[PDB]
Write a protein that binds this ligand. Structure first.
Ligand code: NA
Ligand code: NA
Ligand code: NA
Ligand code: NA
Ligand code: NA
Ligand code: NA
Lengths: 323, 322, 322, 322, 319, 322
């Protein structure tokens, strides 16, 4: 006995943890309608030249139309003179960040991969198009659209469908073997990795690192000092201080909880978790991990928080070499 | 010998000129804004509120602002109005809302009409969002700063909302248009001055540590906490090398309250706390020193961005002269 | 399975019995206190105040409490009442004062008398100090704890001050003794319940996150900040090995609001914020669960010891039933 | 180039004159204080302590101070003195007490008598409180500041307690009155200087980062923590607009150790740590620079309000020359 | 809320690392390695002077061939053999001021105060290791081939050597010697009384260097036990060697030396202490091999505990 | 005006001369250092690594440095080179290691050899320690500072390790000795400059907020956090009164990167963040202003000691001109 008091759950409990955010009864119909809504919007793919140049790759700006009639951007890097269809890698970035430096993924192009890195709407990248909502609250981007009449105007639903469209576009490229596409990302990018592999089940491998956007109600109940999950509390303090609508708010967040999309995943998943992480508590991550629909494995860093995890990029690189 | 301060010594506050650039066409921008507002029909709708009391008729006041959105304000009026009487406009703090109905019933008991605006997208009922060409989630204060022209700034729409509220209230048949005042704390203090500037008929104005003044001075001071950090948050997202620093701060000059201050004709009573690190006193005096009407200030040397004992009585006594 | 929390899970709050022991002679202690108070002539003096408004007669109310000290309260009365009318007693926060005259004028406009006590030695006009045998600067709350008998506790005098103020207001010719209410925040919330217990004729009581409850529970939680840390400060100074732990907390039981709550006959509306680490919800419900009259509560799950939006309207609506 | 410091650069410390006024009747105030003290019979009572050791006779010493209050000091005497010998007076830190008997037995082994005062109301055995006309719980340091005359200041009673202890110890038959020293840390350092000023016969004085100097300088500084913040607490409670700022700091000049420093004739060895934000070096040098006897200082550049390695040996070597 | 264990469970708490199976053999080899190193004791005058004592620098050779320093204070004119007191200082500090122990010399005692290797005193000799990591002094040597190069072992053997030297002094009654210290000095007090069990009394205050695995598991924000986490983050981020690291640390855990202690122990502990959690201290207290009592300060942390110096002084007068 | 800063205003950064003394025999010290290194046979051993990829040949590079210790570096070479090609030396942050193999494979795909040193005793495979006469656990940076001569400084061994690593890579058969670069962050930035100074054949250098510059300036500043506080930690342990301050800082001048900067002939691209309180900009420009070759800088005004978006692309483009 004599187990100390952790802010989160003991590891033995994590592997059986079922989550604590309600799954709406019409979850499957919600996402089929979302995928149908997306398919009814013509992608209108335009590929435009980039300023960054190197003999290692062809660098481009990839533009497409997402739900809400918004133009969305992704960095696109393709190998010079490909001869046979080859793998591709989709990368997703952290909350409020952007797709990052071109040169950080040139080694994947050197392996022969196409790499596409999405810029999330309104964050630090080139996606600057905003879909409207009926009820605008400045309190929270994560909860944008939560007060609309129907649940289809959630900002995170547009974001998830953006990842689905990017995967659809990349898979359809003639140079890309549709059976050899992977996804990876940190934090928000980890959650988007799983949402992408769920809405495009053709994805073969997925490597999220401490994924964000899981188990919203568990995150709220833990009363975390810092981090983006505090947007939930900020919204409540602004628009429902007595929590009269608590059940309706969390039932709608259940539509965009990655843990309830996880059963659709067919990719093999390699998930990295650090146990001192108070930004993405391990319990919220394993809520999604435990519901994954394909083969899966995890890597633990007991003494680390939401930071660089030494050796993980090599582990992911070796994992993605099997594509 | 002068002692060290995080801000400026009080001696230099009274002559401080501000450090945020004034665009050469400031006047044309705001004249164009008021003309744009006047070209949108107000479409005023007044509906009863659930809160009831024998002290006041409480209503929801709805109108259309710039950008094609509906805006809400609380409206409190005497039950059986007789002669035309004074009115008071109130503006709330950043991310808050117009607050409790009962906190202003004593002004109605004096015979005043009270109107309290809900700022767009904040904690109240104004939930309509004007679109922008370039959306950044980094900052509401800088929303619209990357559009082609400076007419899509979110702060511009907000200022014109206060102008419309003043116009509607002054036009009410039971309101003497020469006996209208405005007051507010923090963001509400900055909106009080913007309102008294864009509707110069306002007779008295009582801002408390006003926000939204001297943006560039605020950015240069390195403030650990507070809403002025939204400027740094934006630069970190969309211009980390400050290649567009001059253009961003020039555009912000359009919505810097200090440059609207010369239009104010109301008598102003401004309350300032000297240990305030959310709205540093220097940013407040940048606007105060440019005021176009009579003015006086009240200081709280040992207080920060908090409740200031005696200020509500000072404002009430000040507003009794309406 | 319930999630971790710094306090108790909400489902355990409504059955929580407290931890500070109830003294066996609690009744005799408080009957003796009321007898001690009655044996001191109140010596009521009412003088006009500087603050003036057509909405109310404003006055300074002075009386003598236990220990022979003079105590002050703000007094606001309707300008021309005919029949007996309601009254409202207000109590302020720890180390604060009765506050601004104008923040209570809407109650006078309803026809109420309003009386707002200034606590001894705090930020108001009550500056008289009752002596003690053993003085420790470590804690105001524990002042008098080391005297021979328990009748010199500084909190006892304070509670009897609220009782005397209620007695004076009920005895006023134009105050209906059946239509008196009490309300207050934090320290004022605990004083509201102490007042309604020692003057059970009070009809309504509206405390907000009440202080001065369940002293032992507060000490055992070891909070980072707040006035409950005065208990720890006293122990570190005058009993570092806790040789007198039981005598100290049994003494505090006399001035624990939770053990006066069974005397309350007023209907109580209690507001609680669940992230409050100044007054933990468990200590508040120790008193709530022992209340002797009708009762209801209002929760703010994500708020701490701060402004609670809607609470002033909720209290105003509650107090309109006077 | 002088790098930026929170306090003053060291070159300016040696000429720093202080920033707290100095009353024109300072000398008359303190001559009256000593005469008031002499008019109260000491009524010295000495009883054995439970702590026992063959190295010393350990006793409790009780006397009456100004205000009709009983004051305690620890008294340690050599077992076989035989001949008149030196004595050492020790004063303790703010809110503490005189500390362990065994921490000063090496001075008794030298042949010295040791007396260690317990400050009124702090963690020791001095629990008697002198009354004031106007009680504010905000600050012990400013207790008495609002009375009619300035003779009820709590710090004045404390300073006169150190003088009485010195007078009692010097009059002992086995104490050579010209071989008496004083020493202490923080509050005890300020009391060391006040004692050597009010009993100028004291030969050596060893303060360590002394407290209770240059109150106005401390207030003007951005002190995040420490007992000097009691001044701000008082202003926030009883004078938030600083209308009485000049009166308050003029009265504090009576109990500022820096203005007692010219009376000191003892040789002083002062220890200062330069990163100290509790007692800023500038406030200490305000007193040091005005000292009336020979003096030297010891600097610890990288230390704050903490243990200073080597200082107790330095003081011991200094006090062996008694 | 309950940061540590409730007091009700402290007196039965067994610690979080099992006694190594060859613990006795490890320390018999350590003491034998020490005995094979000549002490080469040198005593030199110190600058601090007082009529109350002779003050000296005491130098000797410890394991690893380094020179180790202790302050030595002796009565000026002793007649018969008399008691002695050994003192140990806090982590990264030094033996402190000469004058803080003159009252023990005035009782007639010899006082010896060790300076720990590499800390703030005069012991500046460093024993080499095969694998050097800058992350942690406490775990220095943990990655060498055998466990005999642990820096903490050298430190423990220094206290044993100092005690052996002091007991062997002609004017010291070897059966009237005590040890005391705060924090690291409290743990060294216990190690000293274990490796030289002739020590009669021991008075540790919130002892350090106990129950390492429990300390790491508690995720303390702050303080010297965080060196364990710092080492793991540097040299084993996935904890592949977790079991070998902690069971190597069991050799230098003071709790497993506690059964050798025969001195009467007076342990002072403060209950709000987050630097040395009470549970880790009672892991050692519960295994002590001699008479024992404790003193509690419920509202205090890792700070001065009023009355403790008088309690220890009264306790040590029975020497 | 008055733009207060924790560091120096940017106008003065470009002229700042440093504050740490340069020893008069600086040139002789480092020529002796290079000669001592040359007298130790490098005994280079290259072993295959376990990380594998078709993009590169990955190996462990081992050599002997000063003090008779074995040092490790990660070595990545392009598979089957047909002509001499460029090489890149990378240095890591304080207490870190050379990092993941795959983070530099894109340079190998360009045709470069990459060598990444592991600093002695840090998180990598270099675990050999050179002995010192006087060991203090207070500071690795100041290790060896108390020895009789200055040739035992730990920083000197570290700097000579970079020289040997550069010498080994420059001497490789398939490496063009005229096309070698160095780059690194923080400690790796200082090592980048030390390397290009002790091996002046280095062609390009790209440090990011370099560490190990202007030790005295670093100590003189506030700086609550960061590795520069090891200086204060050492002083608090081994020189609390600063009696040896001039000796300590004179010795640090031998290993202060600013005084090796005049030897640099590489073109330097230095990246600086202006809110960096770990490596203050003034300390970095002390070295930059003394650089002996072509140079340019990149600024991030709102960033601290963190990831600087765009910097890896900027360095990559810079290194493509190799
Ligand atoms: Na394809
Ligand atoms: Na009108
Ligand atoms: Na009545
Ligand atoms: Na005498
Ligand atoms: Na012996
Ligand atoms: Na070559």
């Amino acid at each position: 006995h004599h187990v100390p008091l952790t802010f989160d759950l003991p590891f033995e409990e994590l592997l059986t943890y079922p989550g604590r955010t309600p799954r709406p009864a019409d979850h499957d119909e919600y996402w089929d309608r979302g995928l149908a809504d997306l398919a009814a919007v013509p992608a209108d793919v335009v590929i435009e030249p980039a300023e960054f140049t190197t003999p290692l790759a062809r660098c481009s700006h990839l533009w497409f139309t997402g739900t809400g009639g918004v133009r969305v951007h992704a960095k696109l890097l393709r190998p010079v003179a490909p001869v046979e269809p080859h793998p591709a890698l989709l990368q997703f970035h952290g909350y409020t960040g952007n797709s990052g430096d071109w040169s950080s993924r040139l080694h994947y192009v050197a392996l022969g991969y196409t790499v596409a890195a999405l810029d999330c709407r309104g964050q630090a990248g080139l996606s600057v198009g905003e879909a409207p909502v009926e009820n605008w609250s400045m309190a929270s981007y994560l909860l944008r659209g939560i007060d609309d009449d129907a649940a289809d105007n959630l900002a995170l639903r547009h974001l998830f469908l953006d990842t689905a469209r990017l995967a659809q576009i990349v898979l359809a490229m003639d140079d890309v073997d549709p059976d050899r596409v992977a996804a990876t990302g940190y934090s928000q990018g980890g959650g988007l990795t799983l949402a992408c592999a769920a809405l495009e089940p053709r994805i073969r491998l997925a490597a999220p690192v401490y994924p964000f956007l899981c188990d919203f109600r568990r995150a709220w109940e833990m009363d975390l000092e810092k981090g983006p999950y505090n947007e939930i509390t900020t919204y409540f303090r602004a628009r429902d201080p007595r929590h009269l609508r608590e059940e309706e708010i969390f039932s709608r967040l259940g539509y965009v909880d990655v843990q309830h999309l996880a059963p659709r995943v067919r990719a093999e998943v390699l998930m990295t978790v650090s146990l001192a992480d108070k930004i993405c508590p391990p319990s919220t991550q394993f809520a999604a991990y435990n519901k994954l629909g394909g083969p899966k494995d995890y890597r633990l860093y007991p003494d680390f928080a939401h930071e660089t995890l030494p050796g993980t990029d090599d582990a992911i690189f070796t994992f993605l070499q099997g594509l």
